[PDB]
């Protein structure tokens, strides 16, 4: 805000960009009923994955 | 008695009063000359002042928002 008469307005592109990305990140990772689901390559140890 | 004018610019008063002095008694050519010179002396002063005022290159107007 260099001068009172300079009309010290400020842009918030940074704020909009972060919120736009966040609107999707939580919508993908923290949107489902759970977070992760372990899966095994065989069944006889899949009793541990669940 | 005195005034700054005489410290600085008396010839002015001289000519300008010669004007009315050369009107009391009819010598009009002298009048024209006195008067022109008075005016040309004078405008110098106002121009001096104008060139003195607003020195230092100010911007046309600092636009204040507030």
Automatic annotation (TrEMBL), chain A:
Name of the protein in its database record: Portal protein
Shown part of the complete sequence: 51 to 100 of 747
TrEMBL record, chain B:
Organism ancestry: Viruses, Duplodnaviria, Heunggongvirae, Uroviricota, Caudoviricetes
Domain of life: Viruses
Protein name per Swiss-Prot or TrEMBL: Uncharacterized protein
Species assigned in the record: Escherichia phage vB_EcoP_SU10
């Amino acid at each position: 805000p260099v001068t009172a008469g300079s009309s010290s307005w400020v842009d918030r592109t940074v704020w909009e960009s972060v919120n736009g990305t966040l609107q999707d990140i939580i919508n993908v990772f923290c949107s489902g009923d759970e977070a992760v689901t372990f899966v095994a390559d065989n069944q006889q140890d899949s009793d541990a994955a669940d | 008695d005195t005034s700054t004018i005489l410290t600085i610019a008396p010839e002015l008063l001289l000519y300008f009063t010669l004007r009315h002095a050369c009107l009391f008694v009819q010598d009009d050519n002298g009048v024209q000359k006195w008067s022109a010179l008075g005016k040309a002396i004078l405008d110098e002063m106002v121009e001096q002042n104008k060139k003195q005022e607003y020195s230092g290159s100010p911007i046309a107007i600092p636009n204040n928002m507030t």
